[PDB]
């Protein structure tokens, strides 16, 4: 296991933090969040959606081919 003060060497990086009591928990929750969430979705839809569509259509065809098979039409 590792602890602070032994992790790695870092030089020249200032970090400015604020107390939680001085700031608001939801700065711009809907005015920034919604722009972000669509942006996040658009970033991944072409990478996550296409196999699920491909599954869905195999599922819907497969089940439709299941029932429309055991019933006859001639003698």
């Amino acid at each position: 296991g590792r602890q602070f003060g032994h992790l790695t060497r870092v030089r020249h990086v200032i970090t400015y933090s604020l107390s939680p009591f001085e700031q608001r928990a939801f700065p711009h929750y809907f005015s920034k969040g919604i722009p972000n969430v669509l942006r996040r979705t658009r970033a991944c839809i072409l990478r996550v959606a296409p196999p699920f569509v491909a599954f869905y259509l195999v599922y819907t065809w497969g089940t439709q081919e299941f029932e429309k098979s055991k019933r006859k039409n001639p003698a």
């Binding site: 030089r11 970090t15 400015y16 933090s17 001085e22």
Partner: protein, 80 residues
């Protein structure tokens, strides 16, 4: 002798004074915040941590100073 000298040398700021603009100090907001300058090439860390104090005038600077005296100060060359 000092007042004599003060009138002798400083008197020369009379005539007219403050007739266009006067500046009085505005209060300064204290923010509970952090600044961390990370430099792993200096051999010792310096950390200064503080709450907001009351200001010069406040009678309770005395009790603060007493509490500060109790905690005090240390340095590696102290013999105690």
């Amino acid at each position: 002798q000092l007042l004599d000298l003060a009138q002798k040398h400083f008197s020369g700021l009379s005539g007219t004074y403050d007739e266009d603009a006067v500046p009085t100090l505005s209060p300064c907001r204290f923010t509970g915040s952090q600044i961390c300058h990370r430099e792993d090439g200096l051999p010792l860390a310096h950390v200064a941590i503080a709450v907001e104090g009351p200001g010069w005038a406040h009678p309770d600077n005395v009790a603060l100073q007493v509490a500060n005296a109790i905690i005090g100060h240390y340095d590696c060359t102290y013999g105690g």
